[model samples]
Target: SRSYRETGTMTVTVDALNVRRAPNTSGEIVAVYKRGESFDYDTVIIDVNGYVWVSYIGGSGKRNYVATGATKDGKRFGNAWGTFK
Candidate 1:
């Protein structure tokens, strides 16, 4: 996955957000992002498993996962425009 931008809230209603090292399940689980929260991400990494890794901005930037099973084609998970601010 590539880096994107977001303006407002990012609603991630997925089963389990698989946090990995390189945007792929093969990487590893760093953390999981719950559903219904507005996540602010800086970079989006797509792994070979088709999983999406979301990286946050700021000093203590964090990374989360968004299972490909929950995402839909042409649908945006973060916010309008699908990019972070």
Candidate 2:
């Protein structure tokens, strides 16, 4: 697919990062985020299950989940006690 400009101003670390349901590893993936693509994210949450989640708009403008480790800033989320993966 042709690369187009994103909608908002946020850093997307890895290409095609998986967006999920809830802020945990066991979440069902709901979407994919392109690397470096800017989008809306209201807050960051490290869940009790050890997954890092970010808030974003899902299909039809509903709230959705994206693993923070899927991005640049959340690199430290790997293998932690509360890791999502």
Candidate 3:
């Protein structure tokens, strides 16, 4: 259920990032990630809504999602919304 697979830590660039329960914006808001906070992710998904989503398993073992950047045709464009470290 991923397009490009990778493993890394995603540091939030935005002051406030909505962490969702699913890949798209329609997903329920599960958490709020502040700037400088990061999560270890194993999946990178480009949603049809034109957002690059990074996913990871939460402490409860459920999948959690956060948008890392915006995309066009699954390719990233413009400045990143988050930095990978």
Candidate 4:
């Protein structure tokens, strides 16, 4: 695995997606985003739950995370919550 750019934008395509205080879903939900809402992330993580999570620092100075999509075997599986651009 080689390192490339990890930061980028993500657009919510699903009806609603939860933004959390941590990278995993079990984390506290801080907000809910609706479709067409886009976010710029400075960090990305492949969670053990098999989802790709993106996060950005909020005004509250806490990192907010959203699960963008799922993956299997280190590769993307299918569309779930959002699209990375």
Candidate 5:
């Protein structure tokens, strides 16, 4: 079984906030956030494609580029607690 863990929130600009379920184009609808609207993740799932899965409390999950800000640049700010491995 795969272990699920909370990696904390990821800081996103209101204008750059894009939320969705699953890690593919066929994913379902989730919550869309805005700038400063922090997203609290409860689980981090590494998919086969290398995208980091961000699980929330009441939603399915969100996918983001692992090499993006939350991973490589280390730009998690404000209430964001940084990312996990």
Candidate 6:
């Protein structure tokens, strides 16, 4: 799986980021992440998969996943992540 780590503070850019129970979109939702919500985030852009996943912890206090597209595209970022200084 492709991954990117942003070394500084970050925020949720989407209106509602679905907190999935697992690292894919087909999983169950643990919570809803609102727009501009302050939170640290990581993206797992599995090349084998067609979509990107946002890795996070759910309301259950465990790790979770969310498909990222509304605000940030995974493939584009994964590709661009290598170019950033």
Please report, in order, the local distance difference test score of every candidate based on alpha carbons: 0.48, 0.55, 0.82, 0.79, 0.46, 0.53
**Of 2 and 3, the candidate ranking higher by TM-score:** 3
* TM-score for candidate 5: 0.50
For residues 1-85, could you state the per-residue lDDT of candidate 5 as single tens digits?
Answer: 1225766766654355445555444566555555555656666654443344466655233344211122222223233223333
Q: Write the per-residue lDDT of candidate 1 for residues 4-55, one digit (tens) a residue.
A: 5543334556544555555555767666666655566555554333434465
lDDT of 4 by residue, 19-63 (tens): 999776598998999999988988877754478777788998998
Q: Candidate 4: which pairs clash?
A: none
Q: Which candidate is the best by lDDT?
A: 3
Candidates 5 and 6: which is better by TM-score? 6
> Could you give the candidate ranking by lDDT, starting with the highest?
3, 4, 2, 6, 1, 5
Model 4 lDDT, residue 61, Cα: 96
Model 2 / residue 78 / CA error / Å:
7.2
| TM-score quality measure for candidate 6 | 0.55
Q: Residue 27 error for model 4, in Å? A: 0.4
- lDDT for 20 (candidate 2): 73
RMSD of 5: 6.9
Clashing pairs for model 3 are none
Candidate 3 lDDT, 1-85, residue by residue in tens: 3467789998888898898998877999989999988778898898554788888888899988888877776678777888888
* lDDT (Cα, 0-100) at 22 in candidate 3: 85
Residue 19, model 6, lDDT = 70
Poorly placed runs, candidate 4 (over 4 Å): 1-5
Q: What's the alpha carbon RMSD for model 2?
A: 10.2
Q: TM-score, each model?
A: 0.48, 0.55, 0.87, 0.84, 0.50, 0.55
Error of 2 at 64 (Å): 0.7
Worst-scoring 10-residue span by lDDT in model 6: 76-85
Native-referenced Cα lDDT, model 3: 0.82
Angstrom error of the Cα, residue 41, model 3: value is: 0.6
